[PDB]
C-alpha cells in the first residue's frame, strides 16, 4: 500500500530557526496530505490539511506545502511549546497512512551529568533483595554510557536503564540505573561504582561507597 | 467545545474480547465521520476503520488486517461510539484513540480523544515494592520494583513538591516492570522538612507513601 516515508526520526534545532520536516510519499497522492503534532503523553492535534491549509488555531508559523509525492511542513521561529513530535498523513487511496514521525530536539550547550549513587534500603534488605541504583541527571548531549563496578570487575548482568526525554525548562537528558542483586550477593562484595562516560569529561565520573564504611 | 473521551481499556489475557467506549459531546454527533486509530509502542499509528454520518447511511470501512476481528458502530440514542475487538492477541496491545473525521471520503482527523490503554498479556497483575533513595543541593528518589501491569503514576509531598523531579519511564523484565524517581531539594530544606513520595497502582488498588530519612552510612 502506500507509505508515507519521514526519512528523519530526529531533527535539532534552536530556539527562534526555521525546520523543515519532509515526507516522502510512496506513489502520487496530490495534496491529500495532513499533518499532525504530538507532544508526550498528549493526544494528537492537526495541524495542516490539503498539504497547506492550516486548522482553525493552527498560529501561522505553521506552513506546509509539496505537490505529488513530497511534502514539507515549515515551522518558522521555533518556540519552545514546539518540542513535540510532527508526522504525516495520506487520505488519497485506502488504507489511511501515517508517517512514523520527527521529533524537534533543541540545542543547547554541553553540560556535565550529576551523578548520585544509592545504597539498598533496608525495607529491600528485609525482603532478601539489593538493588543499587545510580542517577544521572541534567546533561547534555544524550549520549552517555554507564558502567556498573563490583570490587572493581564491571558487571553486566541484572541491569536496568532508563533515560528521560528532553527536559522541558532546561532541555537537558536525565538517565537512572538500577542494579539488581540478591542480599547475600550484595553482602559478598565491598565496593560498588557508578562509571559515568560523556563528552564533557576526558575522564569518566565516578561515583562509588564500600559495605565496610557502613 | 469539541471532546472525546475513550473507556474499555486495561488488562486482558490473549484470546479474549471486550469493547471499546468514545463517548462525545461538543458537536451534532450524527453528521460527523468517526473513527478509530491506534498507536503500537515505538510504532506508527495505524488507522483501523471509520464509519460515515447519517446522510452517507452510516456505512463502514475497515483496514484489511482486521476485517472480521473489528467493528466499529454508533449507538442508538446517544452520542458514543464503540469498537468491538475478539481473538486479541499480544500484537493488539497500544494506545487506541477515537477521532472525529472530516474532508468527507478523504479521511483526515481533526480533532482527537484522550486515548485508552489496552495491554494483552498472560502475566498476573501484581503490586509494586516501594523503597527509599538516601544519600547544598541533595537529591533523594524512590524504587518502584516488581509491578504489573502499567500504569504508575508518582507524586512528591503530595503535589505540592514539583520542581526538580525526575520520572523515568517503566522498564519491563521478567513480566514485571521497574521504575524509578528522583527530585532534588536543597539541604536546607532537608532533613528539616519532611520529602515524602506517593506511588499509585491503580490496577491493584495500591497507594503508597514513603518518607525519605537520612542514613548513618
Ligand atoms: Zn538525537
Ligand atoms: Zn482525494
Ligand atoms: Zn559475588
Ligand atoms: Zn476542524
Ligand atoms: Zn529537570
Known amino acids: 500500500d502506500i507509505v508515507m516515508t519521514q526519512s528523519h526520526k530526529f531533527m535539532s534545532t534552536s530556539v527562534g530557526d526555521r525546520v523543515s520536516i519532509t515526507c516522502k510519499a510512496s506513489?502520487?497522492?496530490?495534496?491529500?496530505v495532513a499533518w499532525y503534532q504530538q507532544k508526550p503523553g498528549q493526544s494528537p492535534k492537526l495541524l495542516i490539511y490539503?498539504?497547506?491549509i492550516r486548522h482553525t488555531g493552527v498560529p501561522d508559523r505553521f506552513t506546509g506545502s509539496g505537490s505529488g509525492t513530497d511534502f514539507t511542513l515549515t515551522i518558522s521561529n521555533v518556540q519552545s511549546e514546539d518540542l513535540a513530535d510532527y508526522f504525516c498523513?495520506?487520505?488519497?487511496?485506502?488504507?489511511?497512512?501515517f508517517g512514523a514521525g520527527t521529533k524537534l530536539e533543541l540545542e543547547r550547550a554541553d553540560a556535565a551529568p550529576t551523578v548520585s549513587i544509592f545504597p539498598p534500603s533496608s525495607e529491600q534488605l528485609t525482603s532478601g533483595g539489593a538493588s543499587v541504583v545510580c542517577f544521572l541527571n541534567n546533561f547534555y548531549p544524550k549520549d552517555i554510557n554507564v558502567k556498573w563496578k563490583i570490587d572493581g570487575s564491571e558487571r553486566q548482568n541484572g541491569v536496568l536503564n532508563s533515560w528521560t526525554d528532553q527536559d522541558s525548562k532546561d532541555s537537558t537528558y536525565s538517565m537512572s540505573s538500577t542494579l539488581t542483586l540478591t542480599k547475600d550477593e550484595y553482602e559478598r562484595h565491598n565496593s560498588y561504582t557508578c562509571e559515568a562516560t560523556h563528552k564533557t569529561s576526558t575522564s569518566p565520573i565516578v561515583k562509588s561507597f564500600n559495605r565496610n564504611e557502613c | 467545545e469539541v471532546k472525546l473521551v475513550e473507556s474499555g481499556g486495561g488488562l486482558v489475557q490473549p484470546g479474549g474480547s471486550l469493547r471499546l467506549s468514545c463517548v462525545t459531546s461538543?458537536?451534532?454527533?450524527?453528521?460527523?465521520?468517526m473513527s478509530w486509530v491506534r498507536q503500537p509502542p515505538g510504532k506508527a499509528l495505524e488507522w483501523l476503520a471509520f464509519?460515515?454520518?447519517?446522510?452517507?447511511?452510516?456505512?463502514?470501512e475497515y483496514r484489511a488486517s482486521v476485517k472480521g476481528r473489528f467493528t466499529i458502530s454508533r449507538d442508538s440514542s446517544q452520542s458514543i461510539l464503540y469498537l468491538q475487538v475478539n481473538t486479541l492477541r499480544a500484537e493488539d496491545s497500544a494506545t487506541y484513540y477515537c477521532?472525529?473525521?472530516?474532508?468527507?471520503?478523504?479521511?483526515?482527523?481533526?480533532?482527537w480523544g484522550q486515548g485508552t490503554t489496552l495491554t494483552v498479556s498472560s502475566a498476573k497483575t501484581t503490586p509494586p515494592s516501594v523503597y527509599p533513595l538516601a544519600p547544598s543541593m541533595v537529591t533523594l528518589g524512590c524504587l518502584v520494583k516488581g509491578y504489573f501491569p502499567e500504569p504508575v503514576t508518582v507524586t512528591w509531598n503530595s503535589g505540592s513538591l514539583s520542581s526538580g523531579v525526575h520520572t523515568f519511564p517503566a522498564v519491563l523484565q521478567s513480566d514485571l516492570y521497574t521504575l524509578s524517581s528522583s527530585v532534588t531539594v536543597p539541604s536546607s530544606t532537608w532533613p528539616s522538612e519532611t520529602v515524602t513520595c506517593n506511588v499509585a497502582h491503580p490496577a491493584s488498588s495500591t497507594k503508597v507513601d514513603k518518607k525519605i530519612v537520612p542514613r548513618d552510612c
Open positions: 477521532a472525529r473525521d472530516r474532508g468527507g471520503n478523504g479521511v483526515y482527523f481533526d480533532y
Open positions: 461538543g458537536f451534532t454527533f450524527t453528521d460527523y465521520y
Open positions: 464509519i460515515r454520518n447519517k446522510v452517507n447511511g452510516y456505512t463502514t
Open positions: 506513489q502520487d497522492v496530490g495534496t491529500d
Open positions: 490539503w498539504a497547506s
Open positions: 498523513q495520506q487520505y488519497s487511496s485506502y488504507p489511511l497512512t
